[PDB]
Amino acid sequence: NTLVKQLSSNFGAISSVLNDILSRLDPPEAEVQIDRLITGRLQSLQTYVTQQLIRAAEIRASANLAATKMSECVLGQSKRVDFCGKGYHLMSFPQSAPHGVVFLHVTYVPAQEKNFTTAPAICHDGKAHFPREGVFVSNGTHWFVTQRNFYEPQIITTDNTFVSGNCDVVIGIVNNTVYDPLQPELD
Amino acid sequence: DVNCSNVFQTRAGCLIGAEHVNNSYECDIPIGAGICASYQTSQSIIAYTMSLGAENSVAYSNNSIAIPTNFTISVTTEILPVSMTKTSVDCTMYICGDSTECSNLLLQYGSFCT
Amino acid sequence: AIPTNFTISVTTEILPVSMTKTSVDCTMYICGDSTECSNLLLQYGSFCTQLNRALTGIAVEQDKNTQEVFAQVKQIYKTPPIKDFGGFNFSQILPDPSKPSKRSFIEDLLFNKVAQKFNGLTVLPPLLTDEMIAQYTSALLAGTITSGWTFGAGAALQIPFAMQMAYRFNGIGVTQNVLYENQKLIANQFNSAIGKIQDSLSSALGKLQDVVNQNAQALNTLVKQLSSNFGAISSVLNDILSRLDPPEAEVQIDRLITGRLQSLQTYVTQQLIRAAEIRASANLAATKMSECVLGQSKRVDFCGKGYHLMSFPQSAPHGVVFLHVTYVPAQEKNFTTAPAICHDGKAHFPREGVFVSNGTHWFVTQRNFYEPQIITTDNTFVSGNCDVVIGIVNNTVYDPLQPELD
């Protein structure tokens, strides 16, 4: 609609019609009137194309950004933090849209939580025990073992705890016995 | 940029028609200098300071860790453009019409329209 | 070569998220305390109408970039009252209450380094002040030393820093038991790395200064154009009308209006190009906020230089300062390795480590640290015979299942 208004503007002349200049004015003296009309429109065309090149860069930047999310969030699982939506992304569902695309991410965000006591290490017979990938928790006096996501207490055995020296090197290490399933198997 | 009932003089401007209160609410209409305006409580246009969020703190401990017990499933929606419309502009039709001398002067600027 | 020692190094990175705002109007620039100037400006009103909609379209994007980098959560977290963070002393990144502003000592050190409106060069004031930006940076540093990565994806989960530091160190392949055996060594190297950055920033922020210089340089260009004649004899509109009548001065006023429209189209073109660089840099800075600060990103040459463990975002005028914690090994030796070890006709392949030797005995350790461990059957597994492997040595396995039966 902006280019339509340029055809009606006189640009300092007496009329914006090309046929009107060659009717009321002689051709030998009409060269100074048509030149101002053409020059006034060339500045509008150069500005129009300049704006289209800038808007094309924003669309190109959005197309390259959406292409990475199409080959990672949809095709495969992206382990990045806050990339495929907002939370632990699992799978995506791309949907079509006029002059665009709509993404449907399925995140995994926990809900409520509780509070339990922990310990950096557990000392048994002078050997420091460390978890493999879990975290030592405790409800009452009992010391259990769970993962770092869902609350699933288990029994602290020898398969989840490994020795790594003595107990006089860990600052703030507690003292608690460790159940050994190998002993009842030999009895 | 005017030096200054319900007159409020801030670092961004001068608003006449909104009473400033000591309470802080959520932002809505941005004005400047971290001051927003909204239609809240009779109810009229009042001025206040925008709220940056609910101030809270986490009790730091040395022998306690929070373990989540319940998990939920949330689905989000994002909008990203892909393409737009395509147009075309020609010098022989937009600049000149059904004339003859108009196309003669355009030949001198043929490199621009090309 | 298996590394035996580890060091802690902190790198810096200056990236700009925003700039200065400036609004230009055709009224206080092209026209004057004159009367005929406005009449001619109505024929070229379509050019100035786009200026009032293109310059304002940049100011709405500068405030939007600030809501994507510094605005990540909806809760304002504060620092805990206990200053004991597991042996690590935090005071350089925490806001000092004795200071008049809510900024730390590092944020206050970089702040010291970082007539025109009468001609139609109005400056729009920013929305977010310098006090509200420091509040968002304090909430990110509070959740990092406490939670770390659980506050940005749900509720805040409290966890001591002694056990949280071991989780950040296991993201490279090293076990967690090594951190507890050298807890005093990491605390001495972490505090020494902060002193090197503090002394370096007290005696160069060129990424945030060149942007301001380019803004003021383009403003002086429009000032020089108003004093020119553009083919006439004067520049003030109140001087030409006082000596020439409007019926005869129309050949000079049109040249001044046209000669100023070229500078407006050139100035608005450079602002749109510089806005694309700030918008592109804002998307890259917002990505590192959710990758380096939020979570442990294993990307190479992305969160500093080397193995990344944690980050600490800071504040900066028209920018953002990051403090990554890199990991680089040092002091390595030479040991003899072997692809596999044959026992009673079975090739034992490792699971996560590699066999090492010192010329006499044969040990086994991981891929990132030298830990002298005996050859066990629980750390390896059999797979076929020994005549299908090109390179394999022969050594007796201790077999931990033998002493258990005695």
UniProtKB/Swiss-Prot annotation, chain A:
The gene is S. It comes from the Viruses. The chain holds residues 960 to 1146 of 1273 of the full protein. Changing D159H: In strain: Alpha/B.1.1.7. Changing L22F: In strain: Omicron/BA.1. This is Spike protein S2'. Changing N10K: In strain: Omicron/BA.1, Omicron/BA.2, Omicron/BA.2.12.1, Omicron/BA.2.75, Omicron/BA.4, Omicron/BA.5, Omicron/BQ.1.1, Omicron/XBB.1.5, Omicron/EG.5.1. Subunit of the fusion protein that is processed upon entry into the host cell. Mediates fusion of the virion and cellular membranes by functioning as a class I viral fusion protein. Contains a viral fusion peptide that is unmasked after S2 cleavage. This cleavage can occur at the cell membrane by host TMPRSS2 or during endocytosis by host CSTL. In either case, this triggers an extensive and irreversible conformational change that leads to fusion of the viral envelope with the cellular cytoplasmic membrane, releasing viral genomic RNA into the host cell cytoplasm. Residues 1-34 form a coiled coil. Disulfide bonds join C73-C84, C123-C167. Glycans are attached at N115, N139, N175. Changing Q112H: In strain: Kappa/B.1.617.1.
Swiss-Prot record, chain B:
Disulfide bonds join C4-C14, C27-C36, C91-C113, C96-C102. Changing A54V: In strain: Beta/B.1.351, Iota/B.1.526. The cytoplasmic Cys-rich domain is palmitoylated. Palmitoylated spike proteins drive the formation of localized ordered cholesterol and sphingo-lipid-rich lipid nanodomains in the early Golgi, where viral budding occurs. Changing A18V: In strain: 19B/501Y. Changing S38A: No effect on O-glycosylation by host GALNT1. Main component of the anti-COVID vaccine Chadox1/AZD1222/AstraZeneca; in which the human tPA leader sequence is added in N-terminus to enhance protein secretion. Belongs to the betacoronaviruses spike protein family. Contains sequence and structural motifs very similar to those of a bacterial superantigen and can directly bind and activate T-cell receptors. Activation of a broad T-cell repertoire may be involved in the hyperinflammatory syndrome in acute COVID disease. The KxHxx motif seems to function as an ER retrieval and binds COPI in vitro. This is Spike glycoprotein. It comes from Severe acute respiratory syndrome coronavirus 2 (2019-nCoV). The chain holds residues 614 to 761 of 1273 of the full protein.
